[PDB]
Amino acid sequence: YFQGRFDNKVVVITGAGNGMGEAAARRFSAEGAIVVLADWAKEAVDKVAASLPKGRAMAVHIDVSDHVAVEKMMNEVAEKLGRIDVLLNNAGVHVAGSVLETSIDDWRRIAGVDIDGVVFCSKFALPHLLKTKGCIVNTASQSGLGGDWGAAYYCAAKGAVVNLTRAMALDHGGDGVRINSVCPSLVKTNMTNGWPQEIRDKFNERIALGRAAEPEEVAAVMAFLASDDASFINGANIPVDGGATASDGAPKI
Amino acid sequence: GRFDNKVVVITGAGNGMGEAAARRFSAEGAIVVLADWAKEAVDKVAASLPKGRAMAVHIDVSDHVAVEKMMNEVAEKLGRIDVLLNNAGVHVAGSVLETSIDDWRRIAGVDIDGVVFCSKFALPHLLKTKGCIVNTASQSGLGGDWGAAYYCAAKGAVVNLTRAMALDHGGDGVRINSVCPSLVKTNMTNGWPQEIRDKFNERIALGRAAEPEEVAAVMAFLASDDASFINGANIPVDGGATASDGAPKIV
Amino acid sequence: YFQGRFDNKVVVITGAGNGMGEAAARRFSAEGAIVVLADWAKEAVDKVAASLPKGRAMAVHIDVSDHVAVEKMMNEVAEKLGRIDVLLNNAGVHVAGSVLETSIDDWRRIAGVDIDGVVFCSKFALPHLLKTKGCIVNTASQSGLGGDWGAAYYCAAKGAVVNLTRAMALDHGGDGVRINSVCPSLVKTNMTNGWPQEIRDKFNERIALGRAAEPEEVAAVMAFLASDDASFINGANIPVDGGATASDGAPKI
Amino acid sequence: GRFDNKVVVITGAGNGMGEAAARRFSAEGAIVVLADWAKEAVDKVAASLPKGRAMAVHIDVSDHVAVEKMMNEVAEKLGRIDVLLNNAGVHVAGSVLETSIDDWRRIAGVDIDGVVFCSKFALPHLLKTKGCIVNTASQSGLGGDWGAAYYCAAKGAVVNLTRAMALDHGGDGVRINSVCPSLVKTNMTNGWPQEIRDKFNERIALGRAAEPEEVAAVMAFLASDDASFINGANIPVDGGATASDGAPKIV
Ligand SMILES: NC(=O)c1ccc[n+]([C@@H]2O[C@H](COP(=O)([O-])OP(=O)(O)OC[C@H]3O[C@@H](n4cnc5c(N)ncnc54)[C@H](O)[C@@H]3O)[C@@H](O)[C@H]2O)c1
Ligand SMILES: NC(=O)c1ccc[n+]([C@@H]2O[C@H](COP(=O)([O-])OP(=O)(O)OC[C@H]3O[C@@H](n4cnc5c(N)ncnc54)[C@H](O)[C@@H]3O)[C@@H](O)[C@H]2O)c1
Ligand code: NA
Ligand code: NA
Ligand code: NA
Ligand code: NA
């Protein structure tokens, strides 16, 4: 019933090597998209691309924090494939700590990819997206919709992405480029599967669905936000969090 | 066939977004129960859908007695309830100083009590199917209007009831979410003047009122497996309206 | 430095017998206000009133859920004292449970005082407030800014108060009546001091300040919102919660 | 004497809301440190206040080296820091397609980095006094603008940094909050045309731009003992702007 939903659409995915990035690549690919799997590292995106239909997936190296590199990537993709239809700004760096536990370097690391990456990839994709009346889906976070204990820089950066999603949706929605985010809770990885049962129980107590988000469940929302069914959704920061942000913060008794 | 043999109960199904939801869910294989107090209108919609896959209920969802009976009779007759769309709603325009106690009672009865009652009496049945609720809230539940004070109170209640019930029941397999439209082309707004409708085109970044089908599309998505990790969300379907900080355009 | 801030202003306080109501009465009284202590029960408001300066405090019986009684109370107060300057809509009923654990009666009990009380007291005070360019402070709740586990009706009612505060502030702010709320976390009572250390520790873990709100701390915000210092604050739902609603819901690790 | 002998560090203190805060805190007995990159302006404000109770620092708060030195020198010289107002800010108008990488760097440097750096290097000193932070965010950090994309990203970062740092440090006795103004009568907006300013009067329910003193009043309140249980709050000082759901007036 979703067969062909993204037939011959060009989807650029940044952070394509991470768990949400791979799940996105596979979901959009299954619905007919041509995927561009953009990431810093080579092995993960190459492996995913080689698993997808011949001629329908390509991998690129990018540092999304480098505006010159990003401009050149977006123009080459549009040149090589004739079009860009969807940008998934899914690159992400996290560092744990308060501002007293994290360095200027930690700030530059988080800000460069999590903020600058969204600004640069959106600014340089937009001329292509305007031609196709395509869209942008930002990977924001639960951590951009309110604060965390012990991730101050990360919360600042994801806060920037949530409000930039709003501002850009106002600037470009009326010219036919819808701009939205997904705000996932912590996604099931092995950088989460590796946590002790004490720690994974504390996360699950706070989520009414009582488990972590699967990456496929976040990908499903990204695909929906890029679909014609989302024609009137613009500037939205969609919580994909099992209820996490629906709480006023009071404990579950 | 996304909703093949799923029983979908839709309040306010005789017109507008409820009708559009009936047609969308019915197209995807649902059996639709169409609840409305507009008897002629909801009968016509039910009769337009595939034989044996649509039934109309003449009901005022403000009436807990009538709501409890409907949800139990539907469950008995069709053996299940999978989806509840709490969509039925009325609007009145004005500040509290320009709208009566009776106006308040009508707004609260349909827009707050209808949602509470329908949720409360559908829930035992949705728990059996790991079904879901989609509330029709509004942009006017996420923030205030000039000149719809009672409506804003009601839709405000719907937005936060969505969150609380999502925490209560999500763990037992019942997702509860809302859609929050801005202006939609329906009977609710077809009497509003061009002066006000034109300013909605300025305040909505997409530059137009929504079609009722564009909101039905999101109701279908929220009831779908692709929304399996969306719970307690008040989804704006507003073209950007609530994304604005309230400021006019800076340039 | 606050001496005289509310000199000869008439402050109507509903739920004047509860802990926030008494703390409000005392705070506004100390700054020169004439207080009207409106509540269902007699003993508490009589005791507070008798503790305050002669001629500067009166107690009334009211059911804020009764629109006829409320209209008559507001007109008699304005008639007797010549003016109303401030309305504190501080009446409150709570019942614990999901919608499956709470009855239609429980819904009518919560809705009548927590919603209807704010609508009725605001509608009937407003003609008086317009004459003095006074204001309204609603006692909303943390529970009106997001959901709780096990208080579904309460969250619906406080949600209504938070958004009604917004709508009314838009309707009346420009005519000189500012309308705001306070959104307290659970306030220290003996209906909280009576809870076991297991249960009070769970509440405190979720509040960065690591303790419950004192009623005086909520009263201080109500007085600020009614002051000339709050001249540009309108339609605001002020969290008085030690950080509770600043959290995205993630656990503290 | 609410701030008698309290050391209050105020960035952007040479003009507008920072200047108004300097005068308000100084009136209530504070010793004010006035940090600004506009040397003439901040010197004039400092010289206008009581002798021995005001000092100007010529600084670009985007520069972490300069910020760390200032906070340590202030603490050494005056023996304490009680309050930090992260107020310094710049604005640029346009979408990302109409504003340059350099524009972004200038906005991010002052509006995001300045706040991060000033907070980070003031904090050890505020922990000693159980002091507080008040950030100047904006209505444009709580929602989006048409035509201020970079500014909205920056103020968005400030709003959520306020929340995270409030959770990190509130327990150690350091409250962190923000004020979120709509239009204020300052150098920042004195170049904006009447067409845009008049529409702010429509979108602000109070019907006027704020005086800078009306925001300084709230900064003083948030640094006061009366705000002892307010933490991680982004307080709108906007006359109702963000209370709106985005809709134009219904009647
Ligand atoms: N149209 C908009 O601009 C807009 C915007 C946001 C939200 N909404 C919400 O959308 C929902 C649907 O409204 P619509 O715009 O499609 O208008 P509509 O008038 O086309 O349809 C509403 C339907 O609800 C029915 N209904 C009303 N009260 C009822 C009751 N007591 N019992 C049973 N049925 C009842 C009506 O008869 C009607 O068929 C409402 O909850 C409304 O508040 C409307
Ligand atoms: N004026 C408004 O409408 C409005 C609305 C909401 C928020 N704000 C915020 O209010 C704050 C104060 O701005 P204002 O309106 O009073 O404008 P202003 O121009 O009157 O004052 C801002 C001051 O900050 C100083 N400053 C700027 N960059 C600096 C830097 N790198 N280092 C040190 N000092 C620096 C400037 O020299 C100036 O003195 C800003 O953060 C602004 O974003 C303004
Ligand atoms: Na998760
Ligand atoms: Na109509
Ligand atoms: Na508390
Ligand atoms: Na200027």
Numbering used by the authors:
A (entry chain B), C (entry chain B): -2 to 250
B (entry chain A), D (entry chain A): 1 to 251
Sentences from the paper on this structure:
In the presence of NADH, acetoin is reduced to 2,3-BDO by the enzyme butanediol dehydrogenase (Bdh). SmBdh exhibits the typical single domain short-chain dehydrogenase/reductase (SDR) architecture. A monomer displays a dinucleotide-binding Rossmann fold that includes seven-stranded parallel β-sheet (β3–β2–β1–β4–β5–β6–β7) flanked by three α-helices (α2, α1, and α8) on one side and three α-helices (α3, α4, and α5) on another. There is an additional small lobe on top of a core structure, formed by two short helices, α6 and α7, creating a deep cleft in which the cofactor is bound, and where the active site is located.
In order to determine the importance of the Gln247 side chain for the catalysis, we developed two mutants of SmBdh: (1) Q247A where this side chain is removed, leaving alanine at position 247 and (2) the double mutant Q247A + V139Q, where the missing glutamine side chain would be reinstated at the position 139 that is present in KpBdh. The SmBdh Q247A and the Q247A + V139Q mutants crystallized in the same space group (P43212) as the WT SmBdh repeating its protein chains arrangement. As with the WT SmBdh, the primary difference between the two molecules in the asymmetric unit in the mutant structures was that molecule A was found in ‘closed’ conformation (that could be best described by ~ 10 Å distance between Cα-atoms of residues Ala93 and Trp192) and molecule B was found in ‘open’ conformation (the corresponding distance is ~ 15 Å). Upon examination of the electron density maps, we were able to locate NAD + cofactor molecule and a substrate in protein molecule A (‘closed’ conformation), whereas in molecule B (‘open’ conformation) the corresponding space is occupied by only adenine diphosphate (as in Q247A mutant) or remains unoccupied (as in Q247A + V139Q mutant) at all. In the Q247A + V139Q double mutant structure, an ethylene glycol molecule was modeled at the substrate-binding pocket. As with the Q247A mutant, acetoin was present during crystallization, but raising its concentration was damaging to the crystals. We suggest that the available space in the substrate binding site became reduced compared to the Q247A single mutant, thereby providing insufficient space for glycerol to fit. Instead, ethylene glycol which is comparable in size to acetoin could fit. In comparison to the WT SmBdh, Q247A mutant showed a ~ 90% loss in activity as predicted by the structure, whereas the double mutant Q247A + V139Q showed ~ 300% improvement in activity in comparison to Q247A mutant. Although the double mutant did not completely restore the loss of Gln247 activity, significant function was regained by introducing the V139Q mutation in this protein.
